[PDB]
Swiss-Prot record:
Span within the parent record: 2 to 133 of 438
PTMs per UniProt: Ubiquitinated and degraded by HtrA2 in apoptotic cells; proteolytic cleavage at specific sites in the BIR domain linker region generating inactive fragments. Mutation of one site reduces but does not abolish cleavage as another site is selected by the protease.
Native organism: Drosophila melanogaster (Fruit fly)
Physiological role: Anti-apoptotic protein which functions as a caspase regulator, using its E3 ubiquitin-protein ligase activity to smother caspase activity. Binds, ubiquitinates and inactivates initiator caspase Dronc, and effector caspases Drice and Dcp-1. Acts as a Nedd8-E3 ubiquitin-protein ligase for Drice. Suppresses apoptosis by targeting the apoptosome for ubiquitination and inactivation. Plays an important role in cell motility. Overexpression suppresses rpr and hid-dependent cell death in the eye.
Gene: Diap1
Name of the protein: Death-associated inhibitor of apoptosis 1
Subunit structure of this chain's protein: Interacts (via BIR 2 domain) with Dronc (via residues 114-125). Rpr, hid and grim can outcompete Dronc for binding Diap1 therefore removing Diap1-mediated ubiquitination. Interacts (via BIR 2 domain) with HtrA2; this displaces any bound Dronc. Interacts with Strica. The N-terminally cleaved form interacts with Ubr3 (via UBR-type zinc finger); the interaction promotes the recruitment and uniquitination of substrate capases such as Dronc.
BIR repeats: 14-80
Family per record: Belongs to the IAP family.
Upper lineage: Eukaryota, Metazoa, Ecdysozoa, Arthropoda, Hexapoda
Domain of life: Eukaryota
């Protein structure tokens, strides 16, 4: 993935993030786990935007993955970085699993 340089929506909620994803073009890139890893769909092309670090990201290659992309381009992301956020995750255990360790 390349990066795009620099109701009411509670886009801190994963459910709602997930809402944004109903006109989402890329059927092989799993919007669910995109929307769980911080991102909401801007609607423009294939470009998503992270609520927590403001990273933007489009041009998804057919073997890319959501977290590693998210990490590559903005690795100091509060959410990825397992800082305190206001994220409200559908399934807290699901989030934990799919976030970079720190073993
Ligand atoms: Zn982020």
């Amino acid at each position: 993935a390349s990066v795009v340089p620099i109701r009411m929506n509670d886009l801190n909620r994963e459910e709602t993030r997930l809402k944004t994803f109903t006109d989402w073009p890329l059927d092989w890139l799993d919007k669910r786990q995109l929307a769980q890893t911080g991102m909401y769909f801007t609607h423009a092309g294939d470009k998503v935007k992270c609520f927590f670090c403001g990273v933007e990201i489009g041009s998804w290659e057919q073997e890319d993955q959501p977290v590693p992309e998210h990490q590559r381009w903005s690795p100091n992301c509060p959410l990825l970085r397992r800082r305190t956020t206001n994220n409200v995750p559908i399934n807290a255990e699901a989030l934990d699993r799919i976030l970079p360790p720190i073993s």
